[PDB]
């Protein structure tokens, strides 16, 4: 503060040096924020210093990043904001920005035809407009504390000077390149600043950035992808663009990774992509060393619904989920259960891995808004299986009465105000198990005293197709069987007289099963097949009876 | 030096009667080929005539799984259940997103109850967007 | 040479008949094609018979289940939030 009016003359002074000299001189003295009001309030000071930025800063980078620094360190406190836009400064930074980007493109093209020393002296002026750059972004960044000069600033062209100072510093990172993804992840939170943005195509110079070393830089890329990601278009964009393989590591590393592969987990392609990667063993660790967490659960239950995802988590011989299904029964784990259940959904060799959890399973889901939760999604990983002996369950477990009970349980109410019912989810879940368990002919038999109650609860409920397709589905199943498909295929069947009626129904997958079904009872029976064909042939020329009725 | 058979018919070796029965099969065929195209559909005819099966020595034709679900959701969930997650997504497109300027860092990204007891999977519902704080304060000198 | 393609086409036209009668003994019952049999008029100067034909409309869409949690509005907008055109 000594010498202030030495600096000032030092700025008059015609030399590179003589004014960059006093340039860093002032730039270390507003490096302490005591004397910052007496030099921001020093008025023939900062024009000197913004006429200087205008003037001497196109040959000279030396002076006009100290005197950005400068603005910066001004710019740190928001109380000596309005001092700093009485002042044209904030129009210098777009201003310098806005030539240097034409100036870097020039420069780029004026490398591929040149000798070897202007190119060492290219690349040393690029990497000084680099952190000329840097701090304009930098200042420009903390005066957009305000979303009025924010929004002042994004009206003129402000999105496409931050892609393209983006684009610059995309091959050596640097820190123009955390400073612009730190302002375009501010700006993100926006919608037209978002629109102008993936329309110059961020999304994509983004994921060519990985590998990236910097923390800062990680997670800043990371968190503008997890803005972008809120869209239903930016999704597939990041999963065929590979962000998935580098990502997977990063989820022992960085915090918001995982919370960004959840995100992408939500896409099919992107469990496929995770299905070869490590991170199948990381969520593992969390989960099972207790230090757990919600999101941890949530994407590992969204990477199950991969069939090698879920013989990965079943280990070899079924150690793998031992532990998995112990931890999610004596803690209550909602969300470990619904993992369980997932593997379970999956069809083949890994379904004999619960073939040692059907009872106790089944006696949770008997006795058991938690608790119910639990229950069903016991029944429904039970529910999943068709390998088990079921033939031995159903009585070793008493199923039948069980089942009779909570079937019968709110009939004869009207769908109207029972099928919102708290019980409804587990008598699907019941008639789902009754038909993959109705497949085997001894199971079939043990379940043959529950045909009335299904012909009850199928003349009940039918608001739902969902319910009568499975239904069917269990109809279908016991149709199959000689030994009971003619108790079910009486002249006056009233199964088959509600098929009849479904035959043409607005579903299409209603009217699948219900040929199939349909098929199978007119091949066992000319005359049902008679009725059939009547039915359908009434359905499709019936214009033509109507209009010779009307002719008669 | 060659044999001898019976085909399919025994047809007398006329000049003219075979011309007439020529024009009887193909008068019959007409109709036939009508009544197969108004009032069969094509699926139902592709699918019986990929099915059959023209026999040599005879003259004759011979005409001889997986749980599914409703046309949206991977596993079958019920309909009070998919109503219930219907309005419960109403209600989250129905809340009041944070200020501009307010201290909101704990995106947290909790799960709702709706999710976690009726869907099998999305269930983690992000609250807010990710937003970068500058380093600003209003403290005057120190 | 003698009767060849006099039989043949009585072969061919009797194979393509019963194909017919196969496919339509298989759909429609005994009782329509009855129906059908009393309502159709052969023509001689024309080749071919005649009935009272016509068509022989469609849904719009149907509202398919979504799995998309994520409802929760997030993105702001300056000339919502803010009441000024970004142009």
Known sequence: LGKIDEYIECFYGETSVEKNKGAVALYELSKNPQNLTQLVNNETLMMALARVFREDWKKHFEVGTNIMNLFVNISKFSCLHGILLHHKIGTLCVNAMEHETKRYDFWIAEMKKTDQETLRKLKTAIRKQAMLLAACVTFLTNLATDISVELKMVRRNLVALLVKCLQMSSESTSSLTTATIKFLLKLSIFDENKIVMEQNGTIEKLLKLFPIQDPELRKAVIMLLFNFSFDSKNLPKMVNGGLVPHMASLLDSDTKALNMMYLLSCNDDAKAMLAYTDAIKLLMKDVLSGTGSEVTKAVLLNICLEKRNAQLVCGQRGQGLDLLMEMSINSRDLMLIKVVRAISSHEGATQNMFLKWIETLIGIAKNEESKSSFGLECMGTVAELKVAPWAKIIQSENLVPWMKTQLQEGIDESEEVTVLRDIKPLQLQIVIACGTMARQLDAARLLAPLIDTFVQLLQSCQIDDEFVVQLLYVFLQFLKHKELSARLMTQDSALGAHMIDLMHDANAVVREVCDNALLIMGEHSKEWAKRIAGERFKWHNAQWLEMVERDD | ?142 | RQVEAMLDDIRQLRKELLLNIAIIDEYIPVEHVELIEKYVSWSEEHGDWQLKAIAYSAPPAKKEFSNNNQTVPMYYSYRADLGASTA
């Not at chain 2, 009887?24 to 699918?47: A, T």
Request: charged share 30%; aromatic share 8%.
């Open chain 2, 1 to 142: 030096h060659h044999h001898h058979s019976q085909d399919g018919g025994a047809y007398s070796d006329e000049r003219q009667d075979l011309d007439q029965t020529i024009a009887e099969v193909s008068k019959e065929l007409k109709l036939k080929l009508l009544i197969v195209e108004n009032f069969i559909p094509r699926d139902v005819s592709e699918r019986i005539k990929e099915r059959a099966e023209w026999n040599e020595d005879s003259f004759e034709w011979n005409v001889n799984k997986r749980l599914v679900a409703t046309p949206g959701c991977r596993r079958p969930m019920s309909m009070c259940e998919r109503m219930l997650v219907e309005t419960a997504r109403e209600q989250f497109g129905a809340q009041r997103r944070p200020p501009i300027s307010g201290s909101g860092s704990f995106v947290e990204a909790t799960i709702p109850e709706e999710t976690i007891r009726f869907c099998g999977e999305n269930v983690v519902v992000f609250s807010a967007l990710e937003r970068f704080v500058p380093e600003v304060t209003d403290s005057d000198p120190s």
